[PDB]
Amino acid sequence: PQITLWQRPLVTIKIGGQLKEALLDTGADDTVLEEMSLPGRWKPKMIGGIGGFIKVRQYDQILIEICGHKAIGTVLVGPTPVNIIGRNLLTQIGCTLNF
Amino acid sequence: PQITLWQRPLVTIKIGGQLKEALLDTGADDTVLEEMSLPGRWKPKMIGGIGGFIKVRQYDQILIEICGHKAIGTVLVGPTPVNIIGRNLLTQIGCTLNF
Numbered sequence: 001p002q003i004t005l006w007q008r009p010l011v012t013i014k015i016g017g018q019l020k021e022a023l024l025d026t027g028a029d030d031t032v033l034e035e036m037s038l039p040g041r042w043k044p045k046m047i048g049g050i051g052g053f054i055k056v057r058q059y060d061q062i063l064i065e066i067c068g069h070k071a072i073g074t075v076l077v078g079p080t081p082v083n084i085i086g087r088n089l090l091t092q093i094g095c096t097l098n099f
Numbered sequence: 100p101q102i103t104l105w106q107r108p109l110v111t112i113k114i115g116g117q118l119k120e121a122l123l124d125t126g127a128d129d130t131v132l133e134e135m136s137l138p139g140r141w142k143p144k145m146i147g148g149i150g151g152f153i154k155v156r157q158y159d160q161i162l163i164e165i166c167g168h169k170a171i172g173t174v175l176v177g178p179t180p181v182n183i184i185g186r187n188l189l190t191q192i193g194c195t196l197n198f
């Protein structure tokens with residue numbers, strides 16, 4: 001689909017049975033989800049944004065279906081006010097930026 | 100152009116006679132440039148993200164070219180590492196997310 005940017009680019013994602021809403025963010029290198037439980041072992045990582053750094057748990061090779069399209073990648077889970085679908089999974093569903 | 104997302108989407112912007120590099124960011128409501136000086140008066144603006152909120156100087160009706168496409172609008176200035184072009188100026192140059 002072609003998404004305009006007048007409102008925040010939110011889409012529905014299916015992740016671990018849960019359907020959550022999320023933001024298609026071209027400014028984000030990583031994908032960051034709000035506090036939830038994912039199976040598997042995790043690493044800790046520190047990632048920084050607009051305020052400063054937060055601590056997240058890094059889960060690798062996790063499956064998200066972003067807007068009807070499946071994608072596999074690294075998902076960081078922790079204290080974000082919104083779920084961010086970053087560039088590592090956007091490439092996978094074939095997302096581009098056009099003008 | 101048709102910009103894909105394997106690398107960070109940086110572009111040359113030109114503001115105040117000088118060329119700078121900025122990230123194209125669909126998850127950023129507003130444009131925020133690095134600490135520079137701009138004409139006229141500013142107002143206070145609190146922006147939040149990952150890691151909380153920060154305070155930036157709001158300037159209005161500032162001309163900025165992104166890829167030789169001119170935009171006149173609101174640019175916030177504050178303590179950021181990378182200049183960010185947010186939705187407010189990406190809708191002006193007619194930018195969409197496609198997939």
Ligand SMILES: CC(C)(C)NC(=O)[C@@H]1CN(Cc2cc3ccccc3o2)CCN1C[C@@H](O)C[C@@H](Cc1ccccc1)C(=O)N[C@H]1c2ccccc2C[C@H]1O
Pocket residue numbers: 023025027028029030031032047048049050051081082084086124125126127128129130131146147148149153178179180181183185
């Ligand atoms: C992997 C992740 C997500 C940690 N990356 C980022 O946060 C990067 C950081 N860089 C590197 C970065 C470090 C840094 C340090 C100080 C200050 C800025 C900084 O940018 C700058 C660009 N951001 C990406 C942003 O697009 C993220 C976005 C997330 C969001 C969206 C909506 C609500 C809350 C959080 C974001 O922070 N956008 C905010 C946003 C951004 C610009 C203008 C207004 C606003 C409001 C809101 O849209």
